[PDB]
Design a protein around this ligand. Structure first.
Ligand SMILES: Cc1cc2nc3c(=O)[nH]c(=O)nc-3n(C[C@H](O)[C@H](O)[C@H](O)COP(=O)(O)O)c2cc1C
Ligand SMILES: Cc1cc2nc3c(=O)[nH]c(=O)nc-3n(C[C@H](O)[C@H](O)[C@H](O)COP(=O)(O)O)c2cc1C
Lengths: 122, 122
């Protein structure tokens, strides 16, 4: 379901933001555009070094939001676009989903986001 | 309280993410590094075109989170850094905080974030 324009954004560097639901409000962490590995079946994989609070939140509520964008990709009304991604998160520590990001020697896990919707917001 | 390194990030284009507490989980929206207007008294101002869900959330819970970063600014262990900003939000349609972003003629409002903490997370 992830559209072509989303893959165009991924070709460009940028800050990715990942929101979770915590006990006393939202939490928000980051990765890089270039770190994302997209697999078939609508899966975005993120290398996890920290994300301990994020992981605790996902354990309680699997639903996450992700945003990313680039000034270098054309939006609907001018240069620059981005996306709001909604999906369910899981943390993997073995198997193909972990191997997808195992190149990162600091990785303790793979954050796997199964995408339910992708909206171009610009 | 906002540190020099944060202002170095703002010299570079990038995607800013703003998380709020929604009715059924977090909400997450964006602006650009170059749109942020920093005022005395630890205030960050964002031009508001949409942000209708965000405004509804802020009306009920003023606490917000913001992230931003850049590969072009050195972090602690290599190239690239970014920030987690925590603060309280208000929406303004007049006064000096609105005038700060009034040059954006599509702006219906100014989102004013009064910063309580700024953490360099990389
Ligand atoms: C631009 C940027 C990229 C980041 N990339 C990662 C990353 O790929 N993996 C990771 O675990 N943390 C990364 N971090 C740090 C996380 O955003 C977060 O601060 C840290 O993992 C702690 O997560 P937690 O608050 O859920 O415990 C990055 C931070 C920034 C500013
Ligand atoms: C890179 C990027 C920059 C954006 N800049 C703004 C902005 O400056 N002001 C704004 O109102 N919306 C901006 N948007 C759209 C918002 O993220 C959001 O989708 C829209 O304001 C609707 O907000 P809401 O879901 O809270 O109703 C931007 C989106 C992207 C991807």
């Amino acid at each position: 379901m992830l559209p072509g324009t989303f893959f165009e954004v991924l070709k460009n560097e940028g800050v990715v933001a990942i929101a979770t639901q915590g006990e006393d409000g939202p939490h928000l962490v980051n990765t890089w555009d270039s770190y994302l590995k997209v697999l078939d079946g609508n899966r975005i994989v993120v290398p996890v070094g920290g994300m301990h609070k994020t992981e605790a939140n996902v354990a309680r509520d699997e639903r996450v939001l992700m945003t990313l964008g680039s000034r270098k990709v054309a939006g609907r009304n001018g240069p620059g676009t981005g996306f709001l991604i909604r999906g369910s998160a899981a943390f993997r520590t073995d198997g193909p989903e972990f191997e997808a990001i195992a190149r990162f020697k600091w990785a303790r896990a793979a954050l796997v986001i199964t995408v339910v919707s992708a909206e171009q917001t610009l």
